[PDB]
C-alpha cells in the first residue's frame, strides 16, 4: 500500500518561490529556504510595529527641525504647549507632512499658534 | 436513499489522532509522552 507522493514539492515549491532575492544559498538551498521564510516573516512583524514607532520618531524630529528655524528659542515642547492650550484636537503629526509640502501653511499654523 | 447522499451523524465517528505529525496537530514531536522515562520508551513498560 505504497504511498510515494508529490505534496512536499508543492509545499516546498511555494516556500521556494517566496525566497527570491536572498543572495545565495538563502535563495536556492531548501534547508535554508525554510528558515529564511521563517526569519523573513518575523522580520516583517517587528519591522511593522517599529515602522509605526519609527515613522512616529521621524515626524517628531521633522516638525522639531521645522519649528526650530525661527531662531528665537521656541522648542518642539512649546509648540505643543500652545498647540493644546489653543484648542486644536489632535493634528496627528501630519503637520510634519504639510510642514514641508505647504511651508507657508505651517507658517500660518505657527503664526496662529502665537496669537 | 442513494449511494451518493449517505453520511454519518456528527459525533458518531471521530478521527483517530495521529501522533508525531506536527506540533500544530497537537501531539507532535514526542507524541504526548513528555521527555524521557519508561513512559516514553517503547516496549511493555510498567507492570500495572
Amino acid at each position: 500500500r505504497v504511498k510515494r507522493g508529490y505534496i512536499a514539492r508543492r509545499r516546498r515549491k511555494k516556500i521556494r518561490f517566496f525566497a527570491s532575492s536572498f543572495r545565495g544559498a538563502h535563495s536556492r538551498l531548501t534547508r535554508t529556504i525554510a528558515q529564511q521564510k521563517i526569519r523573513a516573516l518575523v522580520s516583517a512583524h517587528r519591522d511593522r510595529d517599529r515602522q509605526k514607532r519609527d515613522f512616529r520618531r521621524l515626524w517628531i524630529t521633522r516638525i522639531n527641525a521645522a519649528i526650530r528655524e525661527r531662531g528665537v528659542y521656541y522648542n518642539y515642547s512649546k509648540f505643543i504647549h500652545d498647540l493644546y492650550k489653543r484648542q486644536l484636537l489632535l493634528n496627528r503629526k501630519i503637520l510634519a507632512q504639510i510642514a514641508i509640502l505647504n511651508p507657508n501653511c505651517i507658517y500660518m499654523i505657527y503664526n496662529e499658534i502665537i496669537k | 436513499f442513494r449511494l451518493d447522499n449517505l453520511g454519518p451523524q456528527p459525533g458518531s465517528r471521530k478521527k483517530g489522532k495521529r501522533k508525531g505529525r506536527g506540533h500544530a496537530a497537537g501531539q507532535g514531536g514526542s507524541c504526548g509522552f513528555g521527555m524521557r522515562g519508561q513512559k516514553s520508551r517503547s516496549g511493555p513498560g510498567i507492570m500495572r
Binding site: I38, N104, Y107, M108, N111, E112 | -
Partner: peptide, 28 residues
C-alpha cells in the same frame, strides 16, 4: 509557530469637493 493572515476590511473613497468653510480666515 503560527501562520495566520489578515485581510483588513478597507474602503476606497473618491472625493467630490470641499465646501462650507468661509469663516475666520487666517492668511499671512
Amino acid at each position: 509557530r503560527r501562520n495566520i493572515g489578515h485581510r483588513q476590511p478597507i474602503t476606497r473613497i473618491k472625493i467630490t469637493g470641499i465646501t462650507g468653510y468661509e469663516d475666520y480666515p487666517a492668511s499671512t
